Amino acid sequence: TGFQICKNALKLPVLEVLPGGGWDNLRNVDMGRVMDLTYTNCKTTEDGQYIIPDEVYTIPQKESNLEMNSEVLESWMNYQSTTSLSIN
Amino acid sequence: TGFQICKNALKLPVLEVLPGGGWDNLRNVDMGRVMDLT
Amino acid sequence: LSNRTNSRVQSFGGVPFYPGITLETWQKGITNHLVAIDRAGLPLHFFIKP
Amino acid sequence: LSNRTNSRVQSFGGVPFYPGITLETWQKGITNHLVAIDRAGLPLHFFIKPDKLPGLPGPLVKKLSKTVETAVRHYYTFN
Amino acid sequence: LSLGFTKALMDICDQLEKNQTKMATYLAELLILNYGTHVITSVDAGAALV
Amino acid sequence: ELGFKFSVPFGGFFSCIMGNPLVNAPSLKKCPGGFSQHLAVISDGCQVSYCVKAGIFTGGSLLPVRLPPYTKPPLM
Amino acid sequence: FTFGGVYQECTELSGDVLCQNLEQKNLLTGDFSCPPGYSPVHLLSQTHEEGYSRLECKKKCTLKIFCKTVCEDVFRVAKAEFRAYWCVAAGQVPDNSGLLFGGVFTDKTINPMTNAQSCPAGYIPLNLFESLKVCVSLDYELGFKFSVPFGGFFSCIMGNPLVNAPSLKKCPGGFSQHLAVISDGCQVSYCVKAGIFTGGSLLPVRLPPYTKPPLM
Ligand SMILES: *[C@@H]1O[C@H](CO)[C@@H](O)[C@H](O)[C@H]1NC(C)=O
Ligand SMILES: *[C@@H]1O[C@H](CO)[C@@H](O)[C@H](O)[C@H]1NC(C)=O
């Protein structure tokens, strides 16, 4: 179950986000792998970026959300007082 | 059902938006692949 | 002086949006990224037939 | 004169941030670095069936599922 | 199913077959520790930046 | 024909202050029969809802693609 | 239990600038009231101040012959008191005629019921506090498959009256309290099932089978 042959044949990085592991809802971390992942056929992703194992499939739900909130508050206060007195 | 051969032959990417999967009418998400894509 | 700028971007497919892109490049960058914007299905009990 | 500039940047996946990168480079640098942000799961005791394990008999895997689910219930009730 | 998890199920089934509820609970707890509570069936690979 | 092939059978209207009079004179804001109520619009806090068949709208982005068969595969 | 709706009464004590958006009537009645068969319960009454500069021009005529238009700006600190109430089932209300609870979210918190700072489809964001939004759902099936059965609200000064007149800030039955928002140190919490809300980022995807594995 080694995908190094897939890397040598396709020269492409294999996807690192793979489901099928055991997750505790209590502490929220991964404990181990329950699924077995194989790379016999070196199943590649549709768009040619990764080589998913034969036991998973990827749906291209590509979404991008960008939010930019810029708030500028400027205050200025200038006071000038010139007093001139002349007694002759 | 490996399409890699087509990629090495024609040097042209493959369609990613493909039908034939199961879609639940309740939560509205794909659950699996039903039809076979050769 | 007071300036308030609020930007909201919601994309579906295509190059992941960033502030430094124009619409021409975004549209020309759809040649490899696509998402199913609409779909139509059939009941699965309707397939299993002789 | 008083100047106070505070920037807090939190990243999940992609090239690590630093003030020397433009947003274009960060957005294009996510080609290899990927992090699962959201995920969904199913309870482990629901996949335990003879249909999943034809080798073992019915009542044995049934008792296995029963003890697994009661162990999960005890686990959840302890906390 | 993965080899280690199948082996753990084999061990639990064998312990239960011997009519022993003492070590069975401990082994079940150990399995829960090793493999969590829920098996992930779907993920969303992506990135975030705030 | 266009309505029969596209429109959905109607149950009635009811609002924050007036109900459907087709229930069976007291007025109740409840869809009669097998019709379910769904929100349409909110006007200054007054709820507006309409009664339609639950079979048609199931709350899914999937298109209700229903054409033939008009009967299940008949048995031998 | 049955939740008949909520409404936030807004009373102006100086000007009419703060209650223009901070008021919210009951969804079912379109007013600051409760549907028949429900008892309005005081959820929380609090206050809010806000300073604003108003520019106004006045045409002053001295001696009826010297007329001048003078524009002056005044910085006034408007004060408004807002009272939020809630409608609970007084008795055997008709079923399923009523409203359901789909979770809450603020500008600083995250709503696990939708993993986002919004509401699910079929849900209306209703304004209760200065930053608290409530997901309100009307469809019976949509609420049954998405929303969660509810027990009641309670605040720092008023408890849920459904306990079993002394008032206790306790969730009855197997229901549990969870935070919604903090309004000037007054804790606000709601009672829901502990099974659905486990405080885990895992999405509770519970669908089929609807039974434990049947024996042979
Ligand atoms: C920011 O404030 C300036 C005033 O100095 C104004 O001209 C400009 O339109 C405002 N917005 C942006 C995006 O610059
Ligand atoms: C620093 O102080 C100067 C005043 O000399 C001001 O113009 C500037 O906006 C302040 N901040 C930065 C980041 O330079």
Side-chain angles (χ1 to χ4, degrees):
Chain A
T1 61
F3 47 82
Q4 185 66 214
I5 46 171
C6 310
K7 293 182 176 180
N8 302 330
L10 328 169
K11 303 180 179 182
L12 174 79
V14 83
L15 182 58
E16 73 252 15
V17 176
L18 316 176
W23 186 20
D24 53 3
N25 198 26
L26 283 314
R27 181 261 162 269
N28 277 33
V29 82
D30 298 328
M31 340 315 299
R33 186 60 60 179
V34 185
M35 189 24 46
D36 49 71
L37 83 170
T38 62
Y39 294 87
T40 304
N41 298 328
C42 299
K43 178 183 181 181
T44 324
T45 56
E46 284 80 3
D47 86 320
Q49 294 290 337
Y50 308 100
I51 321 89
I52 56 179
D54 301 330
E55 290 76 13
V56 302
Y57 55 115
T58 59
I59 294 328
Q61 293 183 2
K62 309 179 182 179
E63 290 210 9
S64 304
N65 291 48
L66 214 170
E67 274 90 329
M68 202 175 328
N69 303 115
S70 177
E71 179 178 358
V72 179
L73 302 184
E74 173 277 339
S75 298
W76 169 268
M77 267 168 155
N78 197 320
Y79 166 75
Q80 303 181 0
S81 179
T82 295
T83 59
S84 180
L85 184 138
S86 300
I87 295 180
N88 309 331
Chain B
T1 61
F3 50 87
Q4 178 59 216
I5 308 177
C6 309
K7 292 182 177 178
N8 331 115
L10 311 182
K11 287 332 282 161
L12 151 62
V14 81
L15 209 69
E16 46 274 44
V17 176
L18 297 181
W23 183 277
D24 54 355
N25 198 23
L26 278 311
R27 299 200 318 96
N28 282 67
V29 74
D30 289 318
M31 271 294 91
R33 174 69 68 181
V34 186
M35 311 285 208
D36 35 43
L37 287 208
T38 64
Chain C
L1 181 60
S2 177
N3 269 15
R4 304 179 68 259
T5 70
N6 314 332
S7 300
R8 201 179 87 174
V9 183
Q10 184 178 5
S11 178
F12 294 83
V15 183
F17 181 72
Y18 45 98
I21 179 190
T22 53
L23 266 168
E24 326 191 40
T25 38
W26 196 95
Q27 296 296 335
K28 294 183 178 180
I30 319 294
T31 185
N32 200 86
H33 305 69
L34 289 175
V35 317
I37 308 128
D38 227 1
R39 51 187 62 91
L42 303 182
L44 42 57
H45 56 254
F46 159 90
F47 304 141
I48 48 138
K49 314 290 148 196
Chain D
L1 180 57
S2 179
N3 267 16
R4 297 180 67 257
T5 60
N6 301 331
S7 301
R8 184 172 59 182
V9 177
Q10 193 174 17
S11 177
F12 304 90
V15 184
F17 165 86
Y18 76 131
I21 179 179
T22 60
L23 293 180
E24 304 89 307
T25 326
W26 195 96
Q27 290 287 88
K28 304 170 304 212
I30 62 184
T31 54
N32 186 28
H33 305 67
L34 259 292
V35 163
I37 318 156
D38 153 31
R39 58 190 70 93
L42 298 181
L44 65 177
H45 59 263
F46 260 79
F47 330 107
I48 307 180
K49 263 303 211 156
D51 318 324
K52 182 58 62 181
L53 299 179
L56 291 181
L60 294 188
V61 299
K62 288 171 183 58
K63 181 183 300 182
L64 167 58
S65 35
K66 288 177 180 180
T67 186
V68 165
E69 60 205 341
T70 195
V72 171
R73 291 181 59 88
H74 177 266
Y75 189 98
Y76 266 93
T77 50
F78 190 93
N79 300 121
Chain E
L1 311 175
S2 58
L3 67 168
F5 142 68
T6 53
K7 180 181 180 180
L9 288 198
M10 291 335 307
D11 299 1
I12 296 183
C13 179
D14 297 1
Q15 288 187 358
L16 286 174
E17 186 180 0
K18 300 179 180 180
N19 299 90
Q20 184 181 5
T21 60
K22 303 180 181 181
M23 201 36 48
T25 62
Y26 188 82
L27 193 48
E29 291 315 90
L30 170 58
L31 163 153
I32 296 299
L33 153 75
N34 298 336
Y35 293 149
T37 308
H38 299 75
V39 182
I40 305 175
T41 61
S42 60
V43 278
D44 292 330
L49 182 62
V50 179
Chain F
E1 56 174 3
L2 295 183
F4 199 88
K5 57 198 271 308
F6 262 48
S7 174
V8 49
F10 200 65
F13 268 167
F14 64 97
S15 63
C16 59
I17 63 178
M18 311 295 258
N20 177 28
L22 299 181
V23 297
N24 56 328
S27 302
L28 298 180
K29 305 177 181 60
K30 181 64 178 181
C31 297
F35 289 88
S36 54
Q37 43 94 30
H38 310 321
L39 160 71
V41 78
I42 290 301
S43 179
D44 200 6
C46 182
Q47 92 264 18
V48 188
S49 294
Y50 53 89
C51 307
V52 281
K53 285 307 305 170
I56 296 301
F57 180 82
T58 56
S61 176
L62 185 137
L63 188 65
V65 182
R66 162 64 204 198
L67 308 74
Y70 310 104
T71 167
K72 274 305 140 178
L75 319 173
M76 322 317 93
Chain G
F1 299 94
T2 302
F3 153 74
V6 285
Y7 54 94
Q8 179 188 6
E9 301 180 358
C10 199
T11 299
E12 281 286 349
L13 302 182
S14 60
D16 202 341
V17 195
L18 181 73
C19 283
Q20 67 175 359
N21 41 294
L22 278 298
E23 60 177 358
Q24 181 62 31
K25 305 178 180 181
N26 180 23
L27 179 57
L28 187 148
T29 65
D31 204 332
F32 307 96
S33 62
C34 283
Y38 297 89
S39 299
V41 189
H42 171 271
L43 211 155
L44 180 55
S45 303
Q46 283 190 352
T47 52
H48 187 61
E49 311 177 1
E50 181 172 355
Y52 69 101
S53 300
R54 181 184 302 179
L55 191 277
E56 59 278 347
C57 303
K58 297 180 180 180
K59 177 45 150 203
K60 300 181 180 180
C61 292
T62 60
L63 301 179
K64 299 180 180 180
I65 194 180
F66 294 111
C67 293
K68 52 180 180 180
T69 69
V70 279
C71 301
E72 56 179 359
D73 52 87
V74 181
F75 180 82
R76 300 182 181 180
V77 184
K79 150 58 60 189
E81 191 288 321
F82 55 96
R83 308 174 301 272
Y85 304 84
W86 57 291
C87 311
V88 80
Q92 185 69 211
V93 293
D95 297 357
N96 297 315
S97 58
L99 257 289
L100 296 178
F101 175 78
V104 291
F105 64 95
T106 67
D107 50 350
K108 298 181 180 180
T109 57
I110 175 62
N111 189 25
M113 333 325 297
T114 177
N115 93 98
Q117 301 179 0
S118 63
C119 294
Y123 289 77
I124 303 93
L126 192 162
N127 313 334
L128 258 288
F129 284 0
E130 303 179 5
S131 162
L132 159 50
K133 289 337 165 304
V134 187
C135 303
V136 195
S137 177
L138 272 297
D139 192 7
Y140 301 94
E141 53 266 32
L142 289 186
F144 199 88
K145 87 193 95 163
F146 284 120
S147 173
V148 53
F150 199 63
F153 333 114
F154 57 94
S155 61
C156 58
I157 59 179
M158 261 305 338
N160 182 27
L162 302 184
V163 297
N164 57 329
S167 300
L168 301 181
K169 307 179 183 60
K170 291 322 213 74
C171 297
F175 294 90
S176 48
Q177 74 77 20
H178 317 73
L179 168 71
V181 80
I182 291 299
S183 182
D184 196 7
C186 183
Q187 96 280 358
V188 184
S189 293
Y190 44 100
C191 302
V192 279
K193 296 180 179 178
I196 166 66
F197 191 94
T198 59
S201 180
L202 183 139
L203 186 63
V205 180
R206 145 78 186 139
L207 286 190
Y210 298 103
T211 166
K212 286 184 177 180
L215 315 176
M216 261 317 137

